[model samples]
Target chain A: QIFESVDHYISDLLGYEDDALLAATNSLAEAGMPAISVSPNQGKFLQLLAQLCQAKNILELGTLAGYSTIWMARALPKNGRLITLEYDPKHAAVAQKNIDRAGLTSQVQIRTGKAIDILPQLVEEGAGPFDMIFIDADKPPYTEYFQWALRLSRPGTLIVADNVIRDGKVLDENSTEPAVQGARRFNAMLGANTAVDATILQMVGVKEYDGMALAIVKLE
Target chain B: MNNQIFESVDHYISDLLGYEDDALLAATNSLAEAGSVSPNQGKFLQLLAQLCQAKNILELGTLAGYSTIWMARALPKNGRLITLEYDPKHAAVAQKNIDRAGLTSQVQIRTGKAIDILPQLVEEGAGPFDMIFIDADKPPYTEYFQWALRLSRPGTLIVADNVIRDGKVLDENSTEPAVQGARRFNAMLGANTAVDATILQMVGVKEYDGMALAIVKLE
Candidate 1:
């Protein structure tokens, strides 16, 4: 109850209201998409992070109905681009429709495939040196996804990973959950990587308890 | 309790990063009231400084200099930080802590009321800082934020601590001055067009408060 109350308070105070955002949310529900979109406040937070980085080219590993994609894309300049990956074509289709409805078609592209499959192709195709990268896809192989993010980044890149704290399951070294195991591996990799300065910000509200890993590449 | 778990995780992260050195531990223990930031928050501030590549930082409060040392360590050789502390005794303690950290050359502790010294810094042209941290008294948070904006350039990061006050900010008619101040500051921060800002709900070794992260927009 406190989480919901606080989330609504934040949303009412700082979150914006636009028809595009409204349509995006509505489309998610209409298409039977999971109600897992980032809260309005969290979307604004991501947008601010993108803006702070002056992100011209953004990479997001999830395209859940384009809710967050729209939020981050709005932070980009008029000529900027954001490439988002989604595994399920249905989700991608829903995201495309919503992205178009939000008038972010020019700034957002939904790449269809498994991230584990597509990340390598992107690196091989020289599609990298991104300004900011957000990892919010499948929980398993989060470490591998982060490795790909590193390969695709240059100095000063901002790498953000969500859902790193699944209600403290990361502390369980013997957990059987694939998501938990993936997060544990990812945290170890992030902690050991000396090329970036990083921290985990614990978050609460509008969703289950979780944390986001924020890392900035050290200028070499 | 969830707070205990948060504390465990905080310890876990701090240990992994080797964040707590002897000087920092001494600084925390020397504080008269345990007012310094937790290791996690300190580390978060340091990372923010690094992310922005901040060279010159301005802090409104230097309680025991725990946070000052954290941010100073993130600065480059030529970088500097000027911190304001209201109490001369705290300033003295902060200086000793900073010196013990071997950061005497990079950190300057200015003892006086922040309201009084902020104007002096502006007059002396000491600003356009890359990052500003406000962790001072609560009642004048709005005014402190205004000064932070005046002393910042575009893209400067302004972070304010303890804005949520354990969700006491939800009460519009609270009698507590600290709660009222936080509420007023949040409203002002939200309405200010010069910055894109958001409040993050924080839960950990500290209380269930929040931090305001604001980035000055490019003109």
Candidate 2:
């Protein structure tokens, strides 16, 4: 409850309510979608990261109702592109409607497929060298997702992976849960990779206790 | 304590990238009352410097130069940092530590109250710095932030630490001056349209607190 209260305070000051964003959340609820999108403050934080990178092309691994997609897209210039992958047809359909309602249809492209599948296709099609990548999808393959992110990026690219801490479950090496093991393995892989200068930011407030792994590709 | 685990995690993070040596340890021990940025926070600031590609940095506090060394390392050979410290003895200790770290060429320590020196920098047109870090005296945090903006250009990254003070800012009736100062700074930072800002809740080896991160808007 303290976390929620603090989040409300932060949202009131730094993340304030906007019409389109409110409508997007309402649409998600109306369509019976889980309310698991990034908090408003976190959305603004992501937007700031995109802006800092001067991102022209962004890749997102999840598109649940397109909430975060809209947040990141709003930071892009008119010609910028944001490609998002969604695995569930129902989620993709809802995200499309929400994206259209948010008037970001031109800036965002929704690809309905498993991220594992679409990522390889993106590589084959040479739809890469993206400026920023946000990984917030399935946990078990997060290590694989990060590898693809690295391949599709150049030096100075920003890769942010969410839900890495899972309330400190990442410390457990013997957990049987796929999500736990997946996150644990991903952390080890990220730690071992010498190509990135990375750190895990412990995050709280609004959501369950989690951490985000922020990495910048080192120039070769 | 709940924070014990956070400290352990901080150590884990530090072992990965936040390397500390005898100079940093000596710097803390040299202080009469040792207080410096934790290893995790020091590295985080370094990362922010890299993210912004900052060639020049301005720091309002130079306590023992622990953070100064961390952020200075983020710079290229040509990069420079100017840090301010109010206490003459503290500045001397910091200079020794900085020299120990072989960062004398990259860091310049100025001894004076930030409130007085900030205006001098503005008068001399000393900045349009790439990044500014505020970790000085808390009671004047709001004034420091205003000066931080005055010395900034569009796209500049401004980070202020200890803004939350373990959520004490939420208590309107609290009489703690540091809490009041932080509250004022956070309110101004949140309302000021000149910057896009957010507060990150930080929990680690240090006390429970948060940092205010802002990026100056490009017109």
Candidate 3:
């Protein structure tokens, strides 16, 4: 596919990875993790997004193998912090080791729990108001995760949700797929949301086809 | 030039989130020949502008002020934008459109070759801009970026539009001038150590293309 070709070309040039990053990617398959990590190009996009926010603290919904976590953590300053939530103990365990190998153990924390449960625990503890919130977990709970993401954000906070397009299945009004429905509901919420301004970016690459929603909580 | 699904998706996205007011509608109607930035891309540019809390902006092309209006709307009351258009006819169209939008005071239009005008901005010491957008002539993209660096502070943003022309940029020996220029610029972006950058591939009403975004780190 020309789309895949162009993605590789761009990745080879601007999204080149380092030893720590390369090792982290390989560790995922060694531990039998799903080969669903964000592409190198997407990882660089997230890193740049974090840097543009000048993020000091970040909250990530999914911690699969910590591939994306490492990319974002590298964008932070030495004192910056990232708290990631993972549901599977095995994935969490593998990701923690990967984070350590990247020398980011001091900067990242992995919390194990269903994100639905862990989110309120964070809210009660006043754990965030994070500079950026990335929702990249299971598609079923995307709407709820974003609802929580809003509470953890201040004005000017950036909230990004991935896999919204699902290769354009979202355009189907009568599909029974849960992931498609969930993404459609989430997209509708973003469109009608008064608290933030949002837009969907149609993306193509090795990931095939999908879209990401970028929303910045409007300034007060 | 790609799949119809992309066009369908782009249409859906813009209809939902990229509302164009009457002024923008009027602008597009007048400048039928220009490849005005799609509504979604225009909104994305505004979001980036807002992300950096930009107070001052510089654009390399006005293109009838379509994108200029989008970015300018993100500015605060006192925010300023200076856009350069190479064609006198295009700048005149932009002036009317910008005036129609009630952004006359906040936006400035300069008509001249950017290769000539960039040095003048430097000589006058009109620099350290909060954001510099390069969307003009494709061949000098790298040169424009260097001049943009000379006009930027450490945190300034530098964004260039149309860097990836329908995946034609991947060719190593293509004779097309735009692709050659973009490939050269992409190489410099990879090798340069002064900023962190990325190229986001876009599929939309304008067909398959991409924008290269960079943030100055040391300058």
Candidate 4:
């Protein structure tokens, strides 16, 4: 595929994944985890966005063996931290080992719980005004997670959600797939949600055709 | 499957987020321009400006000023956006469009070749712009980027469009000047230690391509 080839061309020249990243990918395979970790180029793109926002603290809703967790944690300056939530204890344990191997253990913390449960808990505990929030967990609850993400964000916070396009299936308004339905609802809300300025960038990479939503919280 | 799926998807997202007002619609009123960014891309650039809280922006290509209007609208009340264009006729049309959008106070179009004007801006100590958009001709892209670096400060966001050129940039031995130039520029952007860069492959209403987003390293 020319798109995949171009992705490699760009990744080889610019998006470099070191040994720890390789280790993370291998660990996912060894643990029978799906190879759904972001492509090398997408990881680089995430790091660049984190850098651009000068993100001091980050909140991630998924920890699939810490592949992306490592990438975003590297974007943090000294004294910065990242907290990630994982629904499965097994995935959280594997992600912990991966983060330790990447030497990002100090910067990343893994919380094992359903995000629907953990998010409200964080709000009650006065958890965050996070500089950046990434939602990459279950697709059905994407918009619900986004509402919580907003509750945890301050002015100028950048909120990103992955896997919204799902190979352009999002164009089908009447699709029975829960993922597509969830994405459609999320897109509609994002369109009407004037508290933030956001857009979805259609993505084509080593994975499948998909997109990511990038939203910045309004300053007012 | 046909690539039209991508265009359909782009329109879907555009309908949701890339809504263009009457003024922006007028900019394309039958002058039928090619390679002007799609509305979703304009919104992407606009959101980027807002992310950086960009106050002073510099754009290298101002064809029809469609993107200029988008990015300029992201600026604050006192913010300014200076755009460069080669054709006086295009600049005239863009100025009329910009004035119609009520953005004439914030957007300035300089009519001249970017290569000739880039040096002039450096000599005038004009830039260190908070954000710079590069979308001009393909041949001198690397040179344009070098000048962009000279005019930027640490943390400045520099976005260069049309780097992929329908995946032709992968062909190192291609005879096309545009493809070769894109290939060259991507190489330089990767190797330059002064900036942290990444390429986002673009597939949309326009032809398949990519954009390079680089930020000057603060350290």
Q: Which candidate achieves the best DockQ against the true structure? A: 4
Task: Give per-residue CA lDDT, model 3, range B1-219, as digits (tens).
Answer: 568888888888887788999988888887775534589888989999998898889999898888999999989889989899999999999999999999998898999999888899899887778888888878999999899998898878899988888878887889999989998899999898899998888877777777888988964
Clashes of 3: 0
Candidate ordering by TM-score (highest first): 4, 3, 1, 2
**Arrange candidates by lDDT, highest first: which order?**
4, 3, 1, 2
Worst 10 residues of 3 chain B by lDDT: B29-38
Runs with alpha carbons beyond 4 Å of true place in candidate 1 = B32-36
Worst 10 residues of 2 chain B by lDDT: B1-10
Error of model 1, residue A170, in angstroms: 1.2
Question: Residues A82-152, candidate 3, lDDT per residue (tens digit)?
Answer: 99999999989988988998899999999999999999888998988888888899988898899888888
Per-residue lDDT for A78 in model 4?
A: 82
| Residue-wise C-alpha lDDT for candidate 2, range A93-196, written one tens digit per residue | 98898889878889999999989989989999999988999999989999999999998999999999988777776666688999989987887787788999
Give lDDT per model, in order. 0.86, 0.85, 0.87, 0.88
Model 1 has an lDDT value of 0.86
Q: What TM-score does chain A of model 2 get? A: 0.95
lDDT per residue as tens, model 4, A53-118: 899899999888888899999999888999999998989989999999999988898999999999
Query: How does residue B54 of candidate 2 score in lDDT?
Result: 91
Q: Score the docking of each candidate (DockQ).
A: 0.64, 0.59, 0.77, 0.81
> In candidate 2, what are the lDDT values of residues B1-219, reduced to their tens digit?
136666666666666655778777777676765443577777778888988899989999898888898899899988999999999988999998999888989998999999999999999898988899999889999898889999999889999987877677888898999999988888898789999989888776777667888999987
Give lDDT: candidate 1, residue A204: 81
Model 4 Cα shift for residue A62 (angstroms): 1.2
